[PDB]
Amino acid sequence: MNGIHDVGGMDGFGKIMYVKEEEDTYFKHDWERLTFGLVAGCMAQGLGMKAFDEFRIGIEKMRPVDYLTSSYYGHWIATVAYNLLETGVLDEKELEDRTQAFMEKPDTKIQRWENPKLVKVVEKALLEGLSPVREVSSFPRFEVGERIKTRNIHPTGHTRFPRYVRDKYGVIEEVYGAHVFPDDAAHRKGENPQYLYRVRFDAEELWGVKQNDSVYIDLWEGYLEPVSH
């Protein structure tokens, strides 16, 4: 979707708040640390999220004002809740009451519970990862060195086809192989693998200005089309 998250090329966001790495703190609040666990915990078990595709769409669906105002880990919370509701893991009214409860008395303690069984599962995910590489029988359409042209399409659902590179000419730099197709996997429509390519674009083609700059990006075969003659 052409949402607020696709900020590539926009103006008005001001200067970068640069900070020294030895002073840039990871988590400032405890709920932020909690969120990371909540995210990694569910995805490891496949609760509401098999991989990161279903995770990114949840964020993209946020209201523009919430996306810009909530903190970074606010995005993570929104998607985890989105996915757990969607997949029916948790009930709408069920979550609303708890949220309100914790807004009333934030100091409320939670019953601690543990079991090394799940912990072992989470570790498996953190160390083995979730490679989106798959095997297909299709023959890739383009080859390294070939001049390509991104398609002019505006999908309504999730997509990794940023607006600043649509309807533009580029050159294939590499053929990675076949990877899970975001546009489908994110909407639970089946991970329908597609050849992934790294395409190089010149600043002139993207911004209409001759500068010695270039952008490299990975695009799925479904986003590209051959150059007409």
Binding site: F13, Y18, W31, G37, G41, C42, T99, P116, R160, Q211
Partner: protein
């Protein structure tokens, strides 16, 4: 107000309350344990960090064979070193040269190779950097104090797929004689993202 709901954003407390509401619900339903939630925090806040990538840079800075192996088949090389994991399954290493400079970003979200550099910088996930780095990388770099000549090509790498990228900076002209472990100490996190160059240990 009643016709302008989108004008009002949810308060920061709402998100905090929501995270707790989620934690209790998942625990109460025996879907997620507390010791599992801690394992993760411990792993991303105390186990992973830019220190990993720093060693890779130091080894390549001192072993021409390793460097070649690293640039050609990075996925295999990294797997042998053990720097593999969630959001670090497929990594590519781009090398900076006297005529080429590399800078990575994730315009759509904030994709970063956790297993290699740890969690991303605060400014890396914000709109300012993500929006401007692809259209006018030179200005953005100046803000970081990096002024590059026009004869130097700047390559911006946007992480649109699960593939992640890491920048291999040039060895400063002040080292020589230093060991691998001693070089790993001068490689900064920002230098492996492309927003800065490793400064010479001379001074």
């Amino acid at each position: 107000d009643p016709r302008f709901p989108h004008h009002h954003p949810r308060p920061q407390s709402f998100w905090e309350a929501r995270a707790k509401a989620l934690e209790s619900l998942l625990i109460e339903k025996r879907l997620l344990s507390s010791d599992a939630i801690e394992r993760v925090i411990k792993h991303y806040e105390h186990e992973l960090g830019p220190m990993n990538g720093a060693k890779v840079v130091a080894k390549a800075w001192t072993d021409p064979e390793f460097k070649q192996r690293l640039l050609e088949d990075p996925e295999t090389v990294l797997r042998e070193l053990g720097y593999f994991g969630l959001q670090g399954e497929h990594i590519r290493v781009v090398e900076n040269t006297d005529t080429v400079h590399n800078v990575v970003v994730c315009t759509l979200c904030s994709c970063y190779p956790w297993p290699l550099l740890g969690l991303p910088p605060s400014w890396y996930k914000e709109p300012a950097y993500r929006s401007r780095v692809v259209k006018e990388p030179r200005k953005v770099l100046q803000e970081f104090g990096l002024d590059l000549p026009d004869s130097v090509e700047i390559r911006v790498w946007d992480s649109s797929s699960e593939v992640r990228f890491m920048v291999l900076p040039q060895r400063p002209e002040g080292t020589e004689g230093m060991t691998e472990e001693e070089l790993a100490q001068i490689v900064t996190r920002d230098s492996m993202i492309g927003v800065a160059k490793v400064q010479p240990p001379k001074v």
